[PDB]
Short mmCIF file of C-alpha atoms in Angstrom, two decimals:
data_model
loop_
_atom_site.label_atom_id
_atom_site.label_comp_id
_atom_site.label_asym_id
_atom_site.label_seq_id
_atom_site.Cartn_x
_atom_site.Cartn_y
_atom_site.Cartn_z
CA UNK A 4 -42.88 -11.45 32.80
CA UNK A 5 -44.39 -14.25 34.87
CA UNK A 6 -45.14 -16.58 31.97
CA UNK A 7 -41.19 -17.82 31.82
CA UNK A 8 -41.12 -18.62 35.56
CA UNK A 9 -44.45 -20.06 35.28
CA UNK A 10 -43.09 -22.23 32.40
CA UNK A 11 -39.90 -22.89 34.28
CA UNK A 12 -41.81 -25.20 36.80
CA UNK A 13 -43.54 -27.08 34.32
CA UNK A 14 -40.17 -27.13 32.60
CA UNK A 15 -38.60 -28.85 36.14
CA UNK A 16 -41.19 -31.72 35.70
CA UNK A 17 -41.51 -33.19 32.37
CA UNK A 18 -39.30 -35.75 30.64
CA UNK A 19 -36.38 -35.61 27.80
CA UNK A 20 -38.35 -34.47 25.11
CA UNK A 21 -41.08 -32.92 27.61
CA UNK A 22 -38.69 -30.41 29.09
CA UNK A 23 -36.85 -28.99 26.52
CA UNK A 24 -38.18 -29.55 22.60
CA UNK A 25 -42.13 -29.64 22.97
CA UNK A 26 -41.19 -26.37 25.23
CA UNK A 27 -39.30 -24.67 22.88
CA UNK A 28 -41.70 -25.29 19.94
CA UNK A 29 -44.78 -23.99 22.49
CA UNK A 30 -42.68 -20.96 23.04
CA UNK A 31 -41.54 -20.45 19.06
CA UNK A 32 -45.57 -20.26 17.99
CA UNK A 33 -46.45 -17.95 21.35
CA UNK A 34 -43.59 -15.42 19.67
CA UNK A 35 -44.79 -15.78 16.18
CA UNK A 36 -48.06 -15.63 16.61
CA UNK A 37 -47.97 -12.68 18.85
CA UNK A 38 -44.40 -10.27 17.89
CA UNK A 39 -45.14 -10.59 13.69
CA UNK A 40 -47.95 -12.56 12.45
CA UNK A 41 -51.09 -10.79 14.69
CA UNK A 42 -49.93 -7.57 12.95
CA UNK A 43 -50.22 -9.06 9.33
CA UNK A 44 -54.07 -9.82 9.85
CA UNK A 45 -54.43 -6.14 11.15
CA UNK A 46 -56.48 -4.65 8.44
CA UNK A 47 -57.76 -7.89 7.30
CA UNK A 48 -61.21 -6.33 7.00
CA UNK A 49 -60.73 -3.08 6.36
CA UNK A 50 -58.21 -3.21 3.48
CA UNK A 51 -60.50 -6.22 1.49
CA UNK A 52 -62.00 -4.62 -1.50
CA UNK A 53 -65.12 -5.45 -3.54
CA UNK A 54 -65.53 -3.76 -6.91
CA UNK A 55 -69.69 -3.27 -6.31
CA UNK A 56 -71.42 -0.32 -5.44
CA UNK A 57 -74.29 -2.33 -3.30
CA UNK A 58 -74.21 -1.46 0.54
CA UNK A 59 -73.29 -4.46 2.22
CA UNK A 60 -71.88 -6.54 -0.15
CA UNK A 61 -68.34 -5.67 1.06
CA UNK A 62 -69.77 -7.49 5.00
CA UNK A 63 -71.05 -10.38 3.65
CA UNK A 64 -68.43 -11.44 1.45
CA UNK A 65 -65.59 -10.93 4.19
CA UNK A 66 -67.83 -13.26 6.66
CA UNK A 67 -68.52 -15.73 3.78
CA UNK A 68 -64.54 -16.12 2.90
CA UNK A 69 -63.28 -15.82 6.37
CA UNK A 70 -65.48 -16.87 8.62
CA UNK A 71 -62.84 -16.77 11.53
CA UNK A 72 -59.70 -15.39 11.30
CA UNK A 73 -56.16 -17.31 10.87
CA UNK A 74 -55.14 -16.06 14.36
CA UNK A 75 -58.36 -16.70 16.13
CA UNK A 76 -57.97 -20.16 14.87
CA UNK A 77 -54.15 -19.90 16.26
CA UNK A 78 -55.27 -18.21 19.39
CA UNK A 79 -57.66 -20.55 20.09
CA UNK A 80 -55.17 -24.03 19.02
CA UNK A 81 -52.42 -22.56 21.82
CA UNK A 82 -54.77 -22.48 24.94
CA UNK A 83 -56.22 -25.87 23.95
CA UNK A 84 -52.76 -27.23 23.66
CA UNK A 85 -51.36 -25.43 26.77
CA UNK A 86 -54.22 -26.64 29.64
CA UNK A 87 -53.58 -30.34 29.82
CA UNK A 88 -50.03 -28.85 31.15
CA UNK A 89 -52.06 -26.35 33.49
CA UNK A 90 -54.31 -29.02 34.95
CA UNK A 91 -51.14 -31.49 35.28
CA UNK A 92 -49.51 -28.48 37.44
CA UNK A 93 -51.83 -27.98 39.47
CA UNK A 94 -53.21 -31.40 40.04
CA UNK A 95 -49.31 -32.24 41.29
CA UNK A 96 -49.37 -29.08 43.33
CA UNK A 97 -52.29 -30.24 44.89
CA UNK A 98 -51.05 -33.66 45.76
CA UNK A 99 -47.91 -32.27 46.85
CA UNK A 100 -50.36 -29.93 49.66
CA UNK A 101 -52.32 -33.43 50.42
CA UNK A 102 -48.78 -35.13 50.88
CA UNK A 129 -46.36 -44.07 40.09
CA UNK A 130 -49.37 -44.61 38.45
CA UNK A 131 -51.49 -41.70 39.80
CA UNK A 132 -48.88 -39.62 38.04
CA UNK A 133 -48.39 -41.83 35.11
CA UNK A 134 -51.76 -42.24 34.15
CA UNK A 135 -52.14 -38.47 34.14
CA UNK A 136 -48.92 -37.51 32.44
CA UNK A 137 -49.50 -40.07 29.57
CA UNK A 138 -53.14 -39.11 29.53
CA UNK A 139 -51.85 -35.43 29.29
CA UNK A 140 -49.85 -35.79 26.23
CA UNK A 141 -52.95 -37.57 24.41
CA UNK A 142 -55.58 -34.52 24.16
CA UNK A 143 -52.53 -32.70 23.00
CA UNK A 144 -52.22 -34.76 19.87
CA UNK A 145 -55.59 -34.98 19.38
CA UNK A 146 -55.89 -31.08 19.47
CA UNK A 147 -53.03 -30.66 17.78
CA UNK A 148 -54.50 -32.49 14.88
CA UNK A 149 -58.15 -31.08 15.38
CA UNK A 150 -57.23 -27.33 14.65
CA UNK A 151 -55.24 -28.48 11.88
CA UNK A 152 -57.43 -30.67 10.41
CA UNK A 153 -60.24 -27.69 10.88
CA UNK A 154 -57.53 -25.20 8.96
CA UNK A 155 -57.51 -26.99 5.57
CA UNK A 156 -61.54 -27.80 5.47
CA UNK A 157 -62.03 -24.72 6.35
CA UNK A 158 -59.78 -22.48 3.81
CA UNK A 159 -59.26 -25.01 1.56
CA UNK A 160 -55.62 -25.84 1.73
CA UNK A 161 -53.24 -23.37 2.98
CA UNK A 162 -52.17 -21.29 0.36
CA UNK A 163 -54.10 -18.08 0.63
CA UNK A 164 -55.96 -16.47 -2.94
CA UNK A 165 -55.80 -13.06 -4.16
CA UNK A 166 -59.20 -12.86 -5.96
CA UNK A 167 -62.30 -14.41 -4.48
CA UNK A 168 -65.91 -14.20 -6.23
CA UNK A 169 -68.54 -13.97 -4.13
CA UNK A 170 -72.27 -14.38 -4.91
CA UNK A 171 -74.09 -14.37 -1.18
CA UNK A 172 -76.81 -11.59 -0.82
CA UNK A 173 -76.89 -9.10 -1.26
CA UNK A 174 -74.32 -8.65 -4.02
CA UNK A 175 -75.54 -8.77 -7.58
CA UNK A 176 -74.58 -11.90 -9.70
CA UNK A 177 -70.84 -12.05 -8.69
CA UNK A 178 -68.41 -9.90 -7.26
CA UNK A 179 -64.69 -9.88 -7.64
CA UNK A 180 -62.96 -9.04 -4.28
CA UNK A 181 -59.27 -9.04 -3.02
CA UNK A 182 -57.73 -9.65 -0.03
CA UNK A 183 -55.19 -7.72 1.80
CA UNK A 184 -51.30 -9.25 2.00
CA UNK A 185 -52.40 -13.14 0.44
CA UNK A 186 -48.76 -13.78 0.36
CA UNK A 187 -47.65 -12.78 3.80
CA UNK A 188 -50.51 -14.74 5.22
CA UNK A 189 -49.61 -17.91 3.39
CA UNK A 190 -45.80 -17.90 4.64
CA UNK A 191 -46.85 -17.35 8.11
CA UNK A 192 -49.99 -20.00 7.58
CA UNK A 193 -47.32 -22.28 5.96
CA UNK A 194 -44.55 -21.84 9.36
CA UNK A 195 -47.24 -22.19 11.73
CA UNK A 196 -48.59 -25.48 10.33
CA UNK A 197 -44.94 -26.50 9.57
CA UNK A 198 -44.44 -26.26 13.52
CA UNK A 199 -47.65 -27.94 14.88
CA UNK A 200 -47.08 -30.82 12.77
CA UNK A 201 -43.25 -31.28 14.48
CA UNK A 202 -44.91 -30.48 17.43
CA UNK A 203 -47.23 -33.87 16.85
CA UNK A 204 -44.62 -36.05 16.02
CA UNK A 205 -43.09 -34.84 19.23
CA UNK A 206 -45.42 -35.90 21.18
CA UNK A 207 -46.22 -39.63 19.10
CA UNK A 208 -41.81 -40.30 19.91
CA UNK A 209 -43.02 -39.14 23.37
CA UNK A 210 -45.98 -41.94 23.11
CA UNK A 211 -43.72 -44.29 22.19
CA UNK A 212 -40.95 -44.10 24.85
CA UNK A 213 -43.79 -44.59 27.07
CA UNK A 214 -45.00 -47.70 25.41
CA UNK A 215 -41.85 -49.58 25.60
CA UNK A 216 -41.13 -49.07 29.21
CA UNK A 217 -44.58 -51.16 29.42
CA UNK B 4 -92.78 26.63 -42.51
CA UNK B 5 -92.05 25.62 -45.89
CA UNK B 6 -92.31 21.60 -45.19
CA UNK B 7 -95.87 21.78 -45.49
CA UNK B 8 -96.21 23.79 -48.90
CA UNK B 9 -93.94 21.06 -50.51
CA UNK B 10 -96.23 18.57 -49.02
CA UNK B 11 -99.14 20.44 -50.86
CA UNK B 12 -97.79 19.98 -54.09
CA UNK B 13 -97.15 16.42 -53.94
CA UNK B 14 -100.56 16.23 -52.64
CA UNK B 15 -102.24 17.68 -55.82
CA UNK B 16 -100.35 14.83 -57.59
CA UNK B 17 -101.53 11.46 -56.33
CA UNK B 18 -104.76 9.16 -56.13
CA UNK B 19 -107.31 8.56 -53.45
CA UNK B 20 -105.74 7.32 -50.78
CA UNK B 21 -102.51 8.38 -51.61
CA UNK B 22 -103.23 11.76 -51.32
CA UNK B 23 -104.97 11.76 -47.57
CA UNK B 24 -104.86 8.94 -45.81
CA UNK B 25 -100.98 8.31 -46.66
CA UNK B 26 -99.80 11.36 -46.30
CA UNK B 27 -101.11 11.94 -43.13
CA UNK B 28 -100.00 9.14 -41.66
CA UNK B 29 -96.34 10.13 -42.44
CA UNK B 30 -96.88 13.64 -40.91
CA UNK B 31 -98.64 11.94 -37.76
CA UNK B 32 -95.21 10.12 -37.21
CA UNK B 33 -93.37 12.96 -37.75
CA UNK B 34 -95.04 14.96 -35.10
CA UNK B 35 -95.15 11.72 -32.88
CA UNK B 36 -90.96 11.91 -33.45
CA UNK B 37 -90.51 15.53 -33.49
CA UNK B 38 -93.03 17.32 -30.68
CA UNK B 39 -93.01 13.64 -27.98
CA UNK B 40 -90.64 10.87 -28.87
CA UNK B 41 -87.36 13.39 -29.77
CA UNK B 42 -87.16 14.34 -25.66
CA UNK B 43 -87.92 10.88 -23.90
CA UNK B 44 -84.61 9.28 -25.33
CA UNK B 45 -82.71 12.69 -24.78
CA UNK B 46 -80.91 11.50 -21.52
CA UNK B 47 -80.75 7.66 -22.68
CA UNK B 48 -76.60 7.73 -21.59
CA UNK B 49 -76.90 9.70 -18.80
CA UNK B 50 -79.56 8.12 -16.70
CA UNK B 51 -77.86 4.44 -17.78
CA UNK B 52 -77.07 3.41 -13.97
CA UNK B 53 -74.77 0.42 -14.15
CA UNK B 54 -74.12 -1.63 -10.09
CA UNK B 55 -70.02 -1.57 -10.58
CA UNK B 56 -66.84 0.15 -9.74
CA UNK B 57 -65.13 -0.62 -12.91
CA UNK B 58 -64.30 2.24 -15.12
CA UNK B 59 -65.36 2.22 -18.42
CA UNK B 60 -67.80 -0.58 -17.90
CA UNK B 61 -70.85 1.77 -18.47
CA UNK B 62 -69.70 3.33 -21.69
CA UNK B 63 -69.64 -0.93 -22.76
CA UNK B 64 -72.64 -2.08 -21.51
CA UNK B 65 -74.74 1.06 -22.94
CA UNK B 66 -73.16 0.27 -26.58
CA UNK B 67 -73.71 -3.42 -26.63
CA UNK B 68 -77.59 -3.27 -25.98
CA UNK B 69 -78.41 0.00 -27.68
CA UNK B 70 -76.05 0.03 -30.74
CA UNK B 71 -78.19 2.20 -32.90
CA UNK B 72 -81.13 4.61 -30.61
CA UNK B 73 -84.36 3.91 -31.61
CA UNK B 74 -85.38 7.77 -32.72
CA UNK B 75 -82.14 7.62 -35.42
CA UNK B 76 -83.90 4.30 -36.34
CA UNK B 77 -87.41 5.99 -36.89
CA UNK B 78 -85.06 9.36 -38.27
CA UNK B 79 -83.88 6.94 -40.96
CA UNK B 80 -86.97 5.18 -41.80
CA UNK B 81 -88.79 8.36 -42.25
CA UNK B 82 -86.11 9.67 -45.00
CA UNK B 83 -86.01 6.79 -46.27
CA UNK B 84 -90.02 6.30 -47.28
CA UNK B 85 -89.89 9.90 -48.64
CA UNK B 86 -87.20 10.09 -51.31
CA UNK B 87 -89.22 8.13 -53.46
CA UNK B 88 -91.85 10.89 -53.36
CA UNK B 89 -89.16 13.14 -53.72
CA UNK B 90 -88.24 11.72 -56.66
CA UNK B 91 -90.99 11.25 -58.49
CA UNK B 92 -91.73 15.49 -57.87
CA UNK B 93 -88.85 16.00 -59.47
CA UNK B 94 -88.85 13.87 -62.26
CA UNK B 95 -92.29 15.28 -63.19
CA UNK B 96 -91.44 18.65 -62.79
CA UNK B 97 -88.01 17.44 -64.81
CA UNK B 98 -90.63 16.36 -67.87
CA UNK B 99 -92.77 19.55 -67.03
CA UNK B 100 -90.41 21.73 -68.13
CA UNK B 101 -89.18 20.21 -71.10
CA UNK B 102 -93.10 19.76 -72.65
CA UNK B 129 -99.06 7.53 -69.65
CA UNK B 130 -96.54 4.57 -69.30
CA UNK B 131 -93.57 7.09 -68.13
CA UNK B 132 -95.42 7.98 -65.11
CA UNK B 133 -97.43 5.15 -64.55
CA UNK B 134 -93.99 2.77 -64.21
CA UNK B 135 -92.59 5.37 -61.95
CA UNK B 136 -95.80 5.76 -59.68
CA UNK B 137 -95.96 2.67 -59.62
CA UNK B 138 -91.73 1.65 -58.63
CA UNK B 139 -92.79 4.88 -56.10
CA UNK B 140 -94.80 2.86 -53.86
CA UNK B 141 -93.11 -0.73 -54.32
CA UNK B 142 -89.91 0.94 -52.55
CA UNK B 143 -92.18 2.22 -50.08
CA UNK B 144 -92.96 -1.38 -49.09
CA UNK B 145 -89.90 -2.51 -48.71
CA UNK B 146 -88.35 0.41 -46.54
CA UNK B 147 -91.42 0.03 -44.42
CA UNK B 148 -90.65 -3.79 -44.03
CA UNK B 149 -87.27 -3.31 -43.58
CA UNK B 150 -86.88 -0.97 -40.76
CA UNK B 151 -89.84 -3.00 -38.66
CA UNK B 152 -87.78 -6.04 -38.94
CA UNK B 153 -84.47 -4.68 -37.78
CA UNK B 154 -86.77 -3.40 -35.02
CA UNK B 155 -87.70 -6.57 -34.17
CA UNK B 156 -84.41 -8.42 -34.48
CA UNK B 157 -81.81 -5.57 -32.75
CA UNK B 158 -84.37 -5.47 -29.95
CA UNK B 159 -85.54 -8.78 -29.93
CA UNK B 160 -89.44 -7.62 -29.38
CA UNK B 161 -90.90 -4.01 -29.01
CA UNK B 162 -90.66 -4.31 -25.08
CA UNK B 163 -88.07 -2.45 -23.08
CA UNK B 164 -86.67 -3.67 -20.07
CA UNK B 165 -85.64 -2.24 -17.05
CA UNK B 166 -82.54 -4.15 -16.15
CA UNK B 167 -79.87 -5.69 -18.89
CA UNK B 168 -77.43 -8.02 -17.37
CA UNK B 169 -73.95 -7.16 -19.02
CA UNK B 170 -70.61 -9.17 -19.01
CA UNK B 171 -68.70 -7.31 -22.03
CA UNK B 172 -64.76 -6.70 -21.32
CA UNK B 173 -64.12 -4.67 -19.09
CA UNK B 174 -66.88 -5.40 -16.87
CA UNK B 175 -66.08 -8.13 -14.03
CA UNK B 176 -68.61 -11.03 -14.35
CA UNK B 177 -71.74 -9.73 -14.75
CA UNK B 178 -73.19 -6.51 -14.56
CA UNK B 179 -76.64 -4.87 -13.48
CA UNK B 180 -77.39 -2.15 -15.28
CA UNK B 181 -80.91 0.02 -15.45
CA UNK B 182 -82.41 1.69 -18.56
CA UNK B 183 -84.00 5.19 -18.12
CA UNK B 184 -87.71 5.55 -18.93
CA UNK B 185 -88.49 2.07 -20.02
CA UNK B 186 -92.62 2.30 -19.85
CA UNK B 187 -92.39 5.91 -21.65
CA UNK B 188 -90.45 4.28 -24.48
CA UNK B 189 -92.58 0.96 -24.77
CA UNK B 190 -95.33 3.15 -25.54
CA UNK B 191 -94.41 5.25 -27.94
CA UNK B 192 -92.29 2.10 -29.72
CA UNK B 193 -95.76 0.11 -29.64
CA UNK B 194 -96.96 3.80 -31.29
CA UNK B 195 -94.63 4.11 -34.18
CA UNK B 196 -94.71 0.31 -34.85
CA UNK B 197 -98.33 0.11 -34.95
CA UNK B 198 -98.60 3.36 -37.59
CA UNK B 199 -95.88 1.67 -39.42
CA UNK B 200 -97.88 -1.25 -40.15
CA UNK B 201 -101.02 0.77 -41.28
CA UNK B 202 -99.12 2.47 -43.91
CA UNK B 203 -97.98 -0.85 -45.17
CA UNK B 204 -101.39 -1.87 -45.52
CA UNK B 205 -102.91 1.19 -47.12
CA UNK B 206 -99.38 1.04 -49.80
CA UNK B 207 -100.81 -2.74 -50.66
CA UNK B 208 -104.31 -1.82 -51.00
CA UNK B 209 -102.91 0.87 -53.70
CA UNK B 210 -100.88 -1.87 -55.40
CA UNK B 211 -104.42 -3.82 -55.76
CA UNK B 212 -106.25 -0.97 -57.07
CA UNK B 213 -104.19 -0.14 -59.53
CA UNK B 214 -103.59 -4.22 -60.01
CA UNK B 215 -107.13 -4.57 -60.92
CA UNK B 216 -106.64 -1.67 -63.66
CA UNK B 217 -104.49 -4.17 -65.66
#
């Protein structure tokens, strides 16, 4: 709907790379994460089984393993990435209203929190689910489940290609923006 | 019925304590087994609650901890500390019919095996059980079950007590057979 011709004016103001590959890749997770993967993670909760009989045990152990969801995470990683191009927008449009190095220092500026979100969500994806290869069988021992309980999750091996794309992609997306850096640099 | 008029006979043919205090004793611990004891272990299986989904896991966990039930262990004991009796009735009646030493060896063998399947029994008691104390939970990891298991014994005060009971009478007898071996020791 709106989003492409919102996109096409940030598209009509960005540089070589800017307009046309870091745009593309923002676009190729947005369609990912929302026309296949957010259906994978659908009945995330309610197809993980527990082989107990103790009330409960199946809650805690879901919340212990995943304590946010892969597309949260995801969710969360695109707006974080997307704003420092929102603020940029606006902040132009807003001079432009009013109306080299006012825009330089922001642009350059702009492409630095997205590198350092970029690698913030990704480094909180393998710390948090210990690499990114998703298990079949965990064994949980949190209250109130007695001694330990086997308990599978639901599609381990649909998650982990989609997990495995989506990091794939982010980490293109940082190099990106480090050639991006650099072009920068040298103009000096 | 008829148990008691064979008892009467055997009766007529021992010595002092031998004839009362021992041979009440066994029929207390048959009435103990038969009339109380016989009806607290009748539901042992199917009050065993076991905290799992896996099949099979209860039929498992109920065989490793109770491989042999303790009234079949008192059933045995009991037959087994009254053949020797038996026998000696016989034989005696066996050298009635065809009419000091003879029956002194054999009265005297009659009560030594008497010892021995007392002693027996209340150690494999001891050992299969480990103690005369029944527990209310038994933690079970035997294939199939997944880790480890909770699983809760029926009536496990009821059973204490009347396992304290028969082990208790058990040991009286055993004193009462040694004190016969003495007196008749002494004889020379």
């Amino acid at each position: 709907g709106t989003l492409q011709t919102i996109l096409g004016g940030v598209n009509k103001h960005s540089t070589s790379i800017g307009k046309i590959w870091l745009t593309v890749l923002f676009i190729f997770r947005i369609m990912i994460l929302v026309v296949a993967a957010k259906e994978v993670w659908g009945d995330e909760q309610a197809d993980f089984v527990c082989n107990t009989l103790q009330p409960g045990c199946k809650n805690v152990c879901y919340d212990h393993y995943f304590p946010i969801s892969h597309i949260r995470l995801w969710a969360l990683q695109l707006i974080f990435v997307s704003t420092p191009a929102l603020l940029v927008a606006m902040h132009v449009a807003y001079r432009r209203h009013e109306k080299e190095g006012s825009l330089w220092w922001t642009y350059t500026s702009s492409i630095f929190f997205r590198v350092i979100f970029e690698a913030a969500f990704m480094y909180v994806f393998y710390v948090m689910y210990d690499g990114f290869s998703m298990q079949r069988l965990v064994k949980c021992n949190a209250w109130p489940c007695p001694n330990t309980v086997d308990c599978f999750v639901s599609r381990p091996t649909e998650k982990t290609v989609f997990t495995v794309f989506m990091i794939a992609v982010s980490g293109i997306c940082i190099l990106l923006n480090v050639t991006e850096l650099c072009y920068l640099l040298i103009r000096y």
